[PDB]
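User: Can you model how A1AQY sits in this protein?
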Amino acid sequence: DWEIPDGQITVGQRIGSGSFGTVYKGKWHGDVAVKMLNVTAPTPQQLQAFKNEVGVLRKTRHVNILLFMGYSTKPQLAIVTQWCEGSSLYHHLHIIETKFEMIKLIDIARQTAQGMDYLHAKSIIHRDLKSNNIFLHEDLTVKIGDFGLATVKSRWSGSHQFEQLSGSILWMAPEVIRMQDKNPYSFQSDVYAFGIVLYELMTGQLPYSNINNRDQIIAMVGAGALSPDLSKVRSNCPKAMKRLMAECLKKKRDERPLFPQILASIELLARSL
Ligand SMILES: Cn1cnc2ccc(Nc3c(F)ccc(NS(=O)(=O)N4CC(F)C4)c3Cl)c(Cl)c2c1=O
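Assistant: Here's the modeled complex, given as structure tokens:
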């Protein structure tokens, strides 16, 4: 069973407190990450819902997916994963401004597509792909996290949905902003978020960095009147990668490619470097 009994995890350094929980470094058969959920004590029905969502996590066994290791309840709800040695892509790109060579940028994109292709092959929609939950383990291996607990994060009363929106807006497909079309969360909305990660890798920037006001971003992207400025792509970005990024970012979701195609395009342009 995957529940870790209380008393076994030792909590260490606080890594950061986001919209939905706080991550600590921990000790449990070695280094681990422990994400304490920022939520009210669950009801019996909610506790079962939480365990059912852990069922989704358990479907993932792939080197580009952050390794689920266990969960806690009786201290308070928590998800335990491996500890990644290194930083998130957000930290590299936008905080410490690591200067990756293009070959490495493409390899990070390739591994991220590899993990997303695996998730979609297991019928998992990520729903919140973004660079601060893509980790570069040992500066080599991409690990994708923060897809766990979909109903917990989006449906439970008091799950900080307003703060989650602020933290996700830059990666959010126009139809997820509006929530009006049928099944707004889809493989294709994950593709759009991945296109924004491609924009981050290939420009070094967050999209819309000339628009100070998140409130204009949400309205203008949701109305179909704003999209990332691909003229910011670096001069050494392969044309085929710029073309792929534009496809993933299409406003009309039915026009975006899915990850087998994305992965194949990236593998091809990586050989052609
Ligand atoms: C520097 N450093 C190093 N190692 C880290 C490891 C994990 C996390 N965060 C984190 C978490 F602690 C638990 C669950 C998830 N996501 S998850 O529930 O979907 N998870 C994927 C499994 F399948 C279940 C995530 Cl992302 C961070 Cl933040 C760091 C970090 O900052």
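A couple of observations from the model: DSSP finds ten helices and seven strands in the chain. Residues 15, 23, 33, 35, 57, 60, 65-66, 68, 79, 81, 83-84, 88, 133, 135, 145-148 surround A1AQY (CB under 6 Å).
User: Helpful, thanks.
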